[PDB]
């Protein structure tokens, strides 16, 4: 009765569904495209915004905007179009009778979740609401209560170290390098062969390139010496207009900026010594249980060979007696949602919602106290 909704509204992809299930009912990209050309036929027009899946079948006449950049909602009029699309047009539910479980990255602005609270209560009129952290929900879905979670998505990657249900907020690190900064590095790195992708609708083609041909080399300075001696690493890809491109050493140079972020001009360290500098800011008694429970979540952690590369780079930093086990589940793209369906369908969680009656005695500043 009154099954809750779990809407993980990440950057780049929106995953929604019902609480208590094991798979999302709605996975569509988080874009709102508007037409940029001149309409000549009468009737084609009077429709100035395509949201989600029909803005990628009809791209090529649209300019595609992302409302969430770096985990922060930049466009508050286009984010209401995606929430209106994912309730009525995509899930086919009425939000007046279901409580929703939203999802936010750590270390975001406090006025980002202050306006998600205002929108769901004064526009969609949900009975109850709750805003959770991403990397705490990918420990629910992993069968653990202790561990350190590297959650690499599209806007941000962050580490949250948790020991026996107790989080250490002084050791939560956050990078703004993520998967969308590997798409924009692949557009620049492909111009050395002649292929120039420019437009916003041509960035979705080079995004589909990195999901199919890109991988992580276990030894980078050796792999660049065998990518030039022979041509056994090259693979071909067919564009939507029939042209065939050929990619050589740009298959592993694109996910290598997660481990060497000096390729994009960032001064920060890689993701292998960000997940280690946050272990070494935890207390000494719990470091043996974080080396062995190293949960990897999110979509950008799905390259072939990102687990065997990351075990190589923490064992070179950790002491030689610790064993290091990296937990990469096969379904780790939807791990943040599955732990959201676990938490919202819980028997002891049902007194932790922010009810609509509670929203009147406070303002939108109640979400900081209750979450």
């Amino acid at each position: 009765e009154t099954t809750a909704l779990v809407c993980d509204n990440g950057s780049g992809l929106v995953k929604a569904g019902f609480a208590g299930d094991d798979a999302p009912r709605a996975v569509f990209p988080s874009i709102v495209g508007r037409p940029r050309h001149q309409g000549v036929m009468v009737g084609m027009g009077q429709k100035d915004s395509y949201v989600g899946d029909e803005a990628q079948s009809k791209r090529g006449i649209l300019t595609l905007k992302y409302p969430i950049e770096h985990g922060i909602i930049t466009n508050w009029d286009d984010m209401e179009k995606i929430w209106h699309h994912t309730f009525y047009n995509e899930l086919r539910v009425a939000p007046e009778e279901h409580p929703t479980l939203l999802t936010e990255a750590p270390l975001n602005p406090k006025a980002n979740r202050e306006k998600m609270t205002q929108i769901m209560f004064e526009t969609f009129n949900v009975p109850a609401m709750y805003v959770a952290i991403q990397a705490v929900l990918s420990l629910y879905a992993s069968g653990r209560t202790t561990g350190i979670v590297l959650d690499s998505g599209d806007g941000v990657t962050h580490n949250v170290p948790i020991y026996e249900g107790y989080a250490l907020p002084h050791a939560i690190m956050r990078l703004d390098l993520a998967g969308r900064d590997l798409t924009d590095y692949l557009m620049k790195i492909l111009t050395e062969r002649g292929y120039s992708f420019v437009t916003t609708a041509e960035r979705e083609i080079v995004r589909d390139i990195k999901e199919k041909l890109c991988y992580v080399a276990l030894d980078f300075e050796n792999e660049m010496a065998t990518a030039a001696s022979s041509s056994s690493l090259e693979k071909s890809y067919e564009l939507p207009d029939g042209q065939v491109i050929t990619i050589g050493n740009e298959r592993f140079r694109c996910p290598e900026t997660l481990f060497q972020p000096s390729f994009i001009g960032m001064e920060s360290a890689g993701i292998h010594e960000t997940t280690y500098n946050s272990i070494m800011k935890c207390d000494i008694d719990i470091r043996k249980d974080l080396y062995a429970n190293n949960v990897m979540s999110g979509g950008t952690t799905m390259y072939p060979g990102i687990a065997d590369r990351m075990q190589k780079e923490i064992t070179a930093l950790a002491p030689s007696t610790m064993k290091i086990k990296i937990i990469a589940p096969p379904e780790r793209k939807y791990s943040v949602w599955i732990g959201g369906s676990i938490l919202a369908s819980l028997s002891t969680f049902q007194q932790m919602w922010i009810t609509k009656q509670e929203y009147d005695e406070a303002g939108p500043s109640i979400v900081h106290r209750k979450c």
């Binding site: 208590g20 094991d22 798979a23 629910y140 879905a141 992993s142 069968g143 653990r144 209560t145 937990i327 589940p329 096969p330 379904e331 599955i338 369906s341 676990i342 369908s345 819980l346 028997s347 002891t348």
Partner: protein
């Protein structure tokens, strides 16, 4: 651990229930070294949905003792472990449906036995470690408040719990 092995099978309802759950957990423990009746991943999922049902009945039996305690100063150590087994069986129900669909969609080659079914063993080891504290916190609340009206109606004397006195500590070495 070996504390459950030191209990007798002719006890009351809670002791005979916590003896069956350690027999299920011992079938998933040796699967990490491959010496059990559970041969592949498809039997670990059927056992994890079995230990999540037997562990969901001690949440029922543990709450018939927690409400009969007269004052609220003694059940704080009992409700703290009854809320942990509410979480550890909800993970065992949902993360067994998830690992059943991954085994069904991608096939049997995606799961690898060891290092793939360890998400169910780790959530079941934490259920067993939070159910032997539920026996020990319910044994205290059943004998410290035995003479009060309401607790004697459950028919739980101190002799029904078959837990013995501990061993002598070693003097040297």
């Amino acid at each position: 651990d070996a504390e459950v092995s030191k209990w007798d099978d002719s006890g009351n309802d809670i002791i005979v229930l916590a003896k069956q759950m350690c027999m299920i957990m011992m079938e998933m423990t040796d699967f990490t070294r491959g010496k059990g009746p559970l041969k592949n991943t498809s039997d670990v999922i059927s056992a994890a949905k079995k230990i999540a049902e037997a562990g969901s009945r001690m949440d029922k039996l543990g709450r018939t003792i927690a409400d009969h305690c007269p004052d609220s100063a003694c059940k704080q150590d009992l409700l703290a472990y009854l809320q942990r087994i509410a979480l550890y069986c909800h993970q065992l129900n949902i993360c067994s449906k998830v690992k059943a669909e991954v085994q069904n969609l991608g096939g049997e080659l995606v799961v690898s036995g060891v290092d793939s079914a360890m998400s169910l063993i780790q959530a079941a080891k934490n259920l067993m470690n939070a159910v032997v504290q539920t026996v020990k916190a319910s044994y205290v609340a059943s004998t410290k408040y035995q003479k009060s009206q309401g607790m004697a109606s459950l028919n739980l004397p101190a002799v029904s719990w078959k837990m013995k006195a501990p061993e002598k500590k070693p003097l040297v070495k």
